[PDB]
């Protein structure tokens, strides 16, 4: 009995709120655990996501001085690496994000502005998300070029640490790659692959996602550069990923899909992509191995998924 998936973009409304209601910020472990103001702020961002419906403007939020400071620290620290460590695509778009989107140490960009910018670049759009969605639900969004995106910021006591996605990771890690057409097509391919796929393949796709969108390296002429959002938003790991320490292997999906990984330390191993067009082709070949009694394609004119046989 084939798993349901949205067939229109508005149908992402359906399971968008089906998050893990009891989130990371509730653990005694969390940098913000003892902070009741932080607790409430987090629920505030969650209620914004909860009430969001596809098509609406994303609500603007006045960030606090404390939050802007945390952003500032993440921004300045990370900025110092991008020219040398980040891929061309990243460095190419970053100044535009500064000019048109207010990417600056003193200013946390608003999601609506960033979403409009991306729509202009590649048709990618943002949708605020409360918390952790299933891989199935999150990856499905990508098929429509929709990135489920957090709006809250990490707790101010630890600006270099987040166990979770937060706004810094989304804007400084993901957003600049979603501005590139080739990357955008690649990421969407992973989304298309996920539609109606068995649970076992959702997990293989999530693993591929992690070794690409989150922790991917790519060839850049004779050199290698970072493009994964998890690398680009981690000061420590961004420098480490391109030192002699980690092991590097070519992106190869039948191996990548089964490779184990942990979230708590630096990756002992990275996969290197030839280019985003090549990763896309590889994902397209891999999707053909997924037992699905149909074929899918996205029609951007009507914003619907076409389902054949
Ligand atoms: C597949 C999927 C579905 C929903 N969210 C995610 N997701 C994304 S996009 N970025 C990050 S950064 C970090 C430290 C974590 C844990 C995390 C994460 O979980 C991934
Ligand atoms: Fe991420």
Short mmCIF file of C-alpha atoms and ligand atoms in Angstrom, two decimals:
data_model
loop_
_atom_site.label_atom_id
_atom_site.label_comp_id
_atom_site.label_asym_id
_atom_site.label_seq_id
_atom_site.Cartn_x
_atom_site.Cartn_y
_atom_site.Cartn_z
CA UNK A 1 0.00 0.00 0.00
CA UNK A 2 2.08 2.94 -1.43
CA UNK A 3 2.96 5.84 0.96
CA UNK A 4 1.00 9.08 0.40
CA UNK A 5 2.84 12.09 -0.96
CA UNK A 6 1.67 15.60 -1.91
CA UNK A 7 0.80 16.10 -5.60
CA UNK A 8 0.38 19.86 -5.39
CA UNK A 9 2.55 22.43 -3.66
CA UNK A 10 -0.36 23.53 -1.44
CA UNK A 11 -0.50 19.91 -0.20
CA UNK A 12 2.74 20.43 1.74
CA UNK A 13 0.38 22.14 4.24
CA UNK A 14 -0.92 18.67 5.11
CA UNK A 15 1.99 17.21 7.13
CA UNK A 16 4.03 20.41 7.63
CA UNK A 17 3.03 20.50 11.32
CA UNK A 18 3.73 16.87 11.93
CA UNK A 19 6.92 17.51 13.78
CA UNK A 20 8.41 15.89 16.85
CA UNK A 21 6.36 17.92 19.33
CA UNK A 22 8.82 17.22 22.14
CA UNK A 23 11.96 18.83 20.75
CA UNK A 24 15.71 19.10 21.38
CA UNK A 25 15.32 22.30 23.41
CA UNK A 26 13.44 20.34 26.10
CA UNK A 27 16.44 18.15 26.95
CA UNK A 28 18.44 18.96 30.11
CA UNK A 29 21.41 18.87 27.75
CA UNK A 30 20.35 21.84 25.68
CA UNK A 31 22.39 25.04 25.94
CA UNK A 32 19.12 26.87 26.63
CA UNK A 33 17.44 24.35 28.92
CA UNK A 34 17.44 26.45 32.14
CA UNK A 35 16.36 29.57 30.26
CA UNK A 36 12.53 30.07 30.40
CA UNK A 37 12.66 33.17 28.19
CA UNK A 38 14.46 31.04 25.57
CA UNK A 39 11.93 28.24 26.01
CA UNK A 40 9.07 30.69 25.32
CA UNK A 41 10.87 32.32 22.38
CA UNK A 42 11.27 28.88 20.80
CA UNK A 43 7.56 28.12 21.19
CA UNK A 44 6.87 31.54 19.63
CA UNK A 45 8.80 30.62 16.48
CA UNK A 46 7.06 27.22 16.50
CA UNK A 47 3.61 28.85 16.57
CA UNK A 48 4.57 30.96 13.56
CA UNK A 49 5.48 27.78 11.63
CA UNK A 50 2.31 26.03 12.91
CA UNK A 51 0.00 28.75 11.52
CA UNK A 52 1.84 29.26 8.23
CA UNK A 53 0.00 28.09 5.11
CA UNK A 54 1.57 27.75 1.70
CA UNK A 55 1.31 30.95 -0.29
CA UNK A 56 1.31 33.44 2.60
CA UNK A 57 4.09 35.96 3.28
CA UNK A 58 6.45 34.54 5.95
CA UNK A 59 5.92 36.57 9.12
CA UNK A 60 8.73 39.03 10.01
CA UNK A 61 10.10 38.94 13.54
CA UNK A 62 11.89 41.62 15.55
CA UNK A 63 14.98 39.85 16.85
CA UNK A 64 16.33 40.73 20.32
CA UNK A 65 19.75 42.35 20.90
CA UNK A 66 20.94 39.09 22.44
CA UNK A 67 19.90 37.12 19.32
CA UNK A 68 21.55 39.65 16.98
CA UNK A 69 24.77 39.35 18.98
CA UNK A 70 24.75 35.52 18.61
CA UNK A 71 24.18 35.89 14.87
CA UNK A 72 26.98 38.48 14.72
CA UNK A 73 29.48 36.12 16.28
CA UNK A 74 28.53 33.22 14.00
CA UNK A 75 28.59 35.53 10.94
CA UNK A 76 31.99 37.16 11.62
CA UNK A 77 33.73 33.92 12.65
CA UNK A 78 32.43 31.93 9.66
CA UNK A 79 32.83 34.78 7.13
CA UNK A 80 36.61 34.62 7.62
CA UNK A 81 36.73 31.19 5.99
CA UNK A 82 34.42 31.37 3.01
CA UNK A 83 36.76 32.95 0.41
CA UNK A 84 39.33 30.20 0.92
CA UNK A 85 37.16 27.16 1.85
CA UNK A 86 33.70 27.58 0.30
CA UNK A 87 32.86 26.64 -3.32
CA UNK A 88 32.70 29.23 -6.09
CA UNK A 89 28.85 29.14 -6.08
CA UNK A 90 28.82 30.20 -2.44
CA UNK A 91 31.28 33.07 -2.87
CA UNK A 92 29.61 34.16 -6.05
CA UNK A 93 26.20 34.69 -4.40
CA UNK A 94 27.29 35.88 -0.95
CA UNK A 95 27.76 39.55 -1.95
CA UNK A 96 24.24 39.59 -3.49
CA UNK A 97 22.84 38.21 -0.22
CA UNK A 98 24.63 41.06 1.55
CA UNK A 99 23.37 43.73 -0.88
CA UNK A 100 19.73 42.57 -1.31
CA UNK A 101 19.02 40.47 1.78
CA UNK A 102 20.74 42.23 4.67
CA UNK A 103 23.30 39.51 5.38
CA UNK A 104 25.33 41.52 7.89
CA UNK A 105 26.82 41.02 11.35
CA UNK A 106 24.31 43.48 12.89
CA UNK A 107 21.25 42.15 11.09
CA UNK A 108 19.45 38.82 11.00
CA UNK A 109 17.77 38.50 7.58
CA UNK A 110 14.04 37.93 7.42
CA UNK A 111 12.90 34.61 5.82
CA UNK A 112 10.39 36.36 3.49
CA UNK A 113 13.16 38.51 1.97
CA UNK A 114 15.41 35.42 1.60
CA UNK A 115 12.58 33.33 0.09
CA UNK A 116 11.86 36.07 -2.52
CA UNK A 117 15.54 36.26 -3.35
CA UNK A 118 15.73 32.47 -3.88
CA UNK A 119 12.55 32.39 -5.93
CA UNK A 120 14.24 34.91 -8.24
CA UNK A 121 17.42 32.78 -8.38
CA UNK A 122 16.08 29.26 -8.88
CA UNK A 123 12.38 29.16 -7.90
CA UNK A 124 13.42 27.76 -4.50
CA UNK A 125 11.22 29.03 -1.68
CA UNK A 126 11.30 28.80 2.10
CA UNK A 127 8.59 27.57 4.43
CA UNK A 128 9.06 28.15 8.20
CA UNK A 129 9.26 24.86 10.11
CA UNK A 130 8.47 24.25 13.79
CA UNK A 131 10.92 21.43 14.46
CA UNK A 132 12.03 18.09 13.11
CA UNK A 133 9.96 16.63 10.28
CA UNK A 134 10.29 13.03 9.09
CA UNK A 135 12.86 12.55 6.29
CA UNK A 136 9.92 11.55 4.07
CA UNK A 137 8.16 14.88 4.66
CA UNK A 138 11.31 17.05 4.55
CA UNK A 139 12.74 15.46 1.39
CA UNK A 140 9.31 15.58 -0.37
CA UNK A 141 9.30 19.41 0.00
CA UNK A 142 12.52 19.50 -2.10
CA UNK A 143 10.63 17.98 -5.06
CA UNK A 144 8.68 21.25 -5.32
CA UNK A 145 11.83 23.28 -4.63
CA UNK A 146 10.54 24.03 -1.08
CA UNK A 147 13.06 24.12 1.78
CA UNK A 148 11.56 23.71 5.26
CA UNK A 149 13.46 26.28 7.22
CA UNK A 150 13.86 27.17 10.89
CA UNK A 151 13.45 30.74 12.08
CA UNK A 152 14.74 30.51 15.69
CA UNK A 153 18.37 31.05 16.81
CA UNK A 154 20.69 28.97 18.98
CA UNK A 155 20.97 29.96 22.65
CA UNK A 156 23.39 32.84 23.27
CA UNK A 157 25.58 31.04 25.83
CA UNK A 158 27.16 28.87 23.13
CA UNK A 159 27.40 30.71 19.76
CA UNK A 160 29.71 28.13 18.18
CA UNK A 161 27.51 25.19 19.10
CA UNK A 162 24.21 24.01 17.89
CA UNK A 163 22.95 20.38 17.95
CA UNK A 164 20.01 21.49 15.83
CA UNK A 165 19.42 23.41 12.72
CA UNK A 166 18.90 27.05 13.60
CA UNK A 167 18.59 30.21 11.51
CA UNK A 168 22.40 30.63 11.26
CA UNK A 169 22.75 27.17 9.72
CA UNK A 170 19.88 27.70 7.30
CA UNK A 171 21.01 31.12 6.01
CA UNK A 172 24.81 30.69 6.10
CA UNK A 173 24.81 26.95 5.38
CA UNK A 174 21.89 26.17 3.00
CA UNK A 175 20.58 29.34 1.38
CA UNK A 176 23.66 30.22 -0.71
CA UNK A 177 23.72 26.82 -2.47
CA UNK A 178 19.94 26.92 -3.16
CA UNK A 179 20.70 30.12 -5.17
CA UNK A 180 22.60 28.10 -7.76
CA UNK A 181 20.59 26.46 -10.58
CA UNK A 182 22.66 23.26 -10.78
CA UNK A 183 22.56 22.74 -7.00
CA UNK A 184 18.82 23.49 -7.00
CA UNK A 185 18.20 20.79 -9.66
CA UNK A 186 20.30 18.28 -7.73
CA UNK A 187 18.53 18.86 -4.47
CA UNK A 188 15.12 18.63 -6.21
CA UNK A 189 16.18 15.30 -7.70
CA UNK A 190 16.57 13.93 -4.17
CA UNK A 191 13.05 15.20 -3.41
CA UNK A 192 11.59 13.54 -6.54
CA UNK A 193 13.32 10.26 -5.61
CA UNK A 194 11.60 10.32 -2.21
CA UNK A 195 8.04 10.58 -3.52
CA UNK A 196 6.14 7.40 -2.60
CA UNK A 197 9.42 5.51 -1.89
CA UNK A 198 9.46 2.65 0.68
CA UNK A 199 10.77 3.49 4.18
CA UNK A 200 14.05 1.65 3.49
CA UNK A 201 14.75 4.01 0.57
CA UNK A 202 13.73 7.14 2.44
CA UNK A 203 16.59 6.31 4.85
CA UNK A 204 19.05 5.70 1.99
CA UNK A 205 18.01 9.04 0.49
CA UNK A 206 18.39 10.80 3.87
CA UNK A 207 21.93 9.36 4.08
CA UNK A 208 22.72 10.60 0.56
CA UNK A 209 21.31 13.99 1.55
CA UNK A 210 23.61 14.04 4.62
CA UNK A 211 26.71 13.27 2.56
CA UNK A 212 25.80 15.93 -0.03
CA UNK A 213 23.51 18.80 0.94
CA UNK A 214 24.85 18.69 4.57
CA UNK A 215 28.50 17.50 4.43
CA UNK A 216 29.44 17.41 0.75
CA UNK A 217 32.74 18.38 -0.83
CA UNK A 218 33.01 19.14 -4.56
CA UNK A 219 35.83 19.28 -7.12
CA UNK A 220 36.50 22.85 -8.36
CA UNK A 221 38.95 22.64 -11.25
CA UNK A 222 42.09 21.14 -9.71
CA UNK A 223 40.96 21.92 -6.15
CA UNK A 224 38.28 20.71 -3.69
CA UNK A 225 35.86 23.03 -1.84
CA UNK A 226 32.99 22.78 0.67
CA UNK A 227 29.34 22.97 -0.35
CA UNK A 228 27.57 21.07 2.46
CA UNK A 229 25.43 23.24 4.74
CA UNK A 230 26.73 21.45 7.85
CA UNK A 231 30.28 22.29 6.86
CA UNK A 232 29.61 25.91 5.81
CA UNK A 233 27.88 26.61 9.17
CA UNK A 234 30.59 25.01 11.34
CA UNK A 235 33.77 27.01 11.95
CA UNK A 236 35.65 24.00 13.26
CA UNK A 237 34.52 21.46 10.66
CA UNK A 238 34.86 23.78 7.65
CA UNK A 239 38.63 24.00 8.31
CA UNK A 240 38.95 20.32 9.17
CA UNK A 241 37.10 18.95 6.12
CA UNK A 242 39.84 20.29 3.77
CA UNK A 243 42.87 19.34 5.91
CA UNK A 244 44.77 16.04 5.64
CA UNK A 245 42.81 14.47 8.53
CA UNK A 246 39.51 13.19 7.06
CA UNK A 247 39.29 10.46 4.43
CA UNK A 248 37.88 11.40 1.03
CA UNK A 249 36.19 9.17 -1.52
CA UNK A 250 34.35 9.81 -4.79
CA UNK A 251 30.58 10.23 -4.52
CA UNK A 252 29.23 6.77 -5.37
CA UNK A 253 25.60 6.27 -4.41
CA UNK A 254 25.40 2.51 -3.79
CA UNK A 255 28.16 2.98 -1.20
CA UNK A 256 27.17 6.45 0.03
CA UNK A 257 23.53 5.37 0.68
CA UNK A 258 24.60 2.68 3.24
CA UNK A 259 27.49 4.54 4.93
CA UNK A 260 27.00 5.20 8.67
CA UNK A 261 27.51 8.56 10.24
CA UNK A 262 27.14 10.33 13.58
CA UNK A 263 26.10 13.94 14.19
CA UNK A 264 28.18 14.65 17.30
CA UNK A 265 31.79 14.74 16.06
CA UNK A 266 33.53 15.81 12.81
CA UNK A 267 32.94 13.35 9.95
CA UNK A 268 35.80 10.84 9.62
CA UNK A 269 34.90 10.62 5.94
CA UNK A 270 33.53 12.86 3.19
CA UNK A 271 32.25 12.15 -0.33
CA UNK A 272 33.46 14.36 -3.15
CA UNK A 273 31.15 15.30 -6.03
CA UNK A 274 32.38 15.94 -9.58
CA UNK A 275 29.81 18.70 -9.95
CA UNK A 276 26.19 19.23 -9.01
CA UNK A 277 25.04 18.16 -12.52
CA UNK A 278 26.90 14.87 -12.02
CA UNK A 279 25.50 14.30 -8.52
CA UNK A 280 22.04 14.95 -9.98
CA UNK A 281 22.55 12.36 -12.73
CA UNK A 282 23.73 9.82 -10.13
CA UNK A 283 20.67 10.49 -7.95
CA UNK A 284 18.47 10.11 -11.04
CA UNK A 285 20.01 6.66 -11.75
CA UNK A 286 19.64 5.67 -8.09
CA UNK A 287 15.96 6.73 -8.03
CA UNK A 288 15.32 4.26 -10.91
CA UNK A 289 16.35 1.40 -8.56
CA UNK A 290 13.66 2.39 -6.01
CA UNK A 291 10.61 0.05 -6.17
CA UNK A 292 7.80 2.47 -7.06
CA UNK A 293 4.88 1.45 -9.31
CA UNK A 294 4.95 4.88 -10.97
CA UNK A 295 7.17 7.62 -12.32
CA UNK A 296 7.17 11.27 -11.14
CA UNK A 297 8.04 14.70 -12.54
CA UNK A 298 7.44 18.22 -11.33
CA UNK A 299 5.59 20.61 -13.61
CA UNK A 300 6.74 24.13 -12.49
CA UNK A 301 4.02 25.81 -14.62
CA UNK A 302 1.23 24.40 -12.48
CA UNK A 303 3.29 23.47 -9.41
CA UNK A 304 2.00 19.90 -9.51
CA UNK A 305 3.71 16.52 -9.51
CA UNK A 306 2.85 14.51 -12.65
CA UNK A 307 2.44 10.76 -11.86
CA UNK A 308 2.79 8.31 -14.81
CA UNK A 309 1.44 4.70 -14.71
C1 LIG B 1 16.50 14.81 6.52
C2 LIG B 1 16.22 16.01 7.44
C3 LIG B 1 14.92 16.36 7.82
C4 LIG B 1 14.70 17.47 8.65
N1 LIG B 1 15.73 18.20 9.08
C5 LIG B 1 17.00 17.90 8.72
N2 LIG B 1 18.11 18.61 9.17
C6 LIG B 1 18.69 19.63 8.40
S1 LIG B 1 17.99 20.12 6.93
N3 LIG B 1 19.83 20.29 8.87
C7 LIG B 1 20.41 19.91 10.10
S2 LIG B 1 21.79 20.57 10.89
C8 LIG B 1 21.72 19.51 12.26
C9 LIG B 1 22.72 19.53 13.44
C10 LIG B 1 20.60 18.66 12.11
C11 LIG B 1 20.26 17.59 13.18
C12 LIG B 1 19.85 18.87 10.91
C13 LIG B 1 18.69 18.21 10.42
O1 LIG B 1 18.16 17.28 11.05
C14 LIG B 1 17.28 16.79 7.90
FE1 LIG B 2 20.64 21.45 7.30
#
